[PDB]
Amino acid sequence: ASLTEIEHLVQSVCKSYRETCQLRLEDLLRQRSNIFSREEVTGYQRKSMWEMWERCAHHLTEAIQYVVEFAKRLSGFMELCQNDQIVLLKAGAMEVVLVRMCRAYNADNRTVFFEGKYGGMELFRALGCSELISSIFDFSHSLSALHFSEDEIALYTALVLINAHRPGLQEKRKVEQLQYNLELAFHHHLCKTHRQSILAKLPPKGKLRSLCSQHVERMQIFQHLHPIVVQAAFPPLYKELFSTGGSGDHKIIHRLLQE
Numbered sequence: 053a054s055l056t057e058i059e060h061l062v063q064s065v066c067k068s069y070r071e072t073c074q075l076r077l078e079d080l081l082r083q084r085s086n087i088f089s090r091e092e093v094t095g096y097q098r099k100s101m102w103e104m105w106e107r108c109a110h111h112l113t114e115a116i117q118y119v120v121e122f123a124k125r126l127s128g129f130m131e132l133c134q135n136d137q138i139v140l141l142k143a144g145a146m147e148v149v150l151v152r153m154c155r156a157y158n159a160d161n162r163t164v165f166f167e168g169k170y171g172g173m174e175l176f177r178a179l180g181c182s183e184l185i186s187s188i189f190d191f192s193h194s195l196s197a198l199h200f201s202e203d204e205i206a207l208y209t210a211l212v213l214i215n216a217h218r219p220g221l222q223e224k225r226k227v228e229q230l231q232y233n234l235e236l237a238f239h240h241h242l243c244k245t246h247r248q249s250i251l252a253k254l255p256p257k258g259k260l261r262s263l264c265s266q267h268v269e270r271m272q273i274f275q276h277l278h279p280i281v282v283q284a285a286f287p288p289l290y291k292e293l294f295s296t297g298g299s300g301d302h303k304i305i306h307r308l309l310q311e
């Protein structure tokens with residue numbers, strides 16, 4: 053691409069993100085003083101493991117659905133073959149969700165927006181996966197220290213998704229070309245806004261991958277303890293992506309990709 057084309061891709065990506073971001077940043081920021089009470093926190097801590105897992109899976113599924121829509125609107129993604137579309141979303145959708153989540157994280161009091169108010173990580177004690185929760189909060193705290201603009205989140209999450217190293221890609225070169233163009237757009241935008249100093253401070257890829265594998269592991273542990281809960285009350289998209297015995301999702305996401 054030339055320079056006009058790179059800048060055109062920057063605004064295309066930022067638009068696709070804006071149209072698919074699920075929660076508006078201003079809405080999240082206006083709620084920061086709305087903080088769960090002691091009594092409400094205790095109420096969450098008293099819920100059963102399986103009901104809290106069910107609520108979390110519901111919320112992650114909705115977030116993943118917006119990430120699928122982001123991808124469908126992302127320049128060049130629907131021109132990839134359908135095998136590679138699904139490989140990229142299976143490997144990348146949760147990573148994109150985890151990055152988007154820092155927008156709902158308040159670094160000043162270490163709280164997150166959840167079901168109407170902000171609370172700290174003690175809200176989630178009933179899940180019985182505190183080590184994973186702490187890691188997610190720490191990751192979000194590190195991202196918050198970079199002070200991402202919405203445009204930077206757009207460009208960065210596009211690259212999280214368009215990763216030409218994902219195993220299973222059939223047209224590896226076509227994905228490499230898209231990734232390189234999106235890399236130019238990202239770096240051009242940082243150069244133009246004098247923000248290149250964040251590049252060295254972005255998390256290594258191993259970190260996002262560690263969080264998602266831990267998510268699957270804790271999930272599989274919970275499923276082994278409550279198998280019928282996962283079968284009867286978890287969203288089909290989540291079940292197929294992540295659960296033991298899951299089909300793999302190729303069919304729900306293939307049908308989201310067409311609609």
Ligand SMILES: C[C@@H]1C[C@H](Oc2cc(Cl)cc(NC(=O)C[C@@H](CCC(=O)O)c3ccccc3)c2Cl)CCN1C(=O)C1CCCC1
Pocket residue numbers: 105108109111112115152153154156157164165166167168176179181184185188189192267270
């Ligand atoms: C879901 C949550 C994320 C949770 O802690 C965090 C951490 C950080 Cl950085 C940000 C947010 N908040 C948000 O992004 C906003 C809320 C709004 C929900 C609403 O519409 O009311 C949201 C939207 C979309 C997806 C998830 C959450 C939360 Cl909740 C911890 C627990 N759990 C998990 O994954 C656990 C469960 C099992 C495996 C790990």
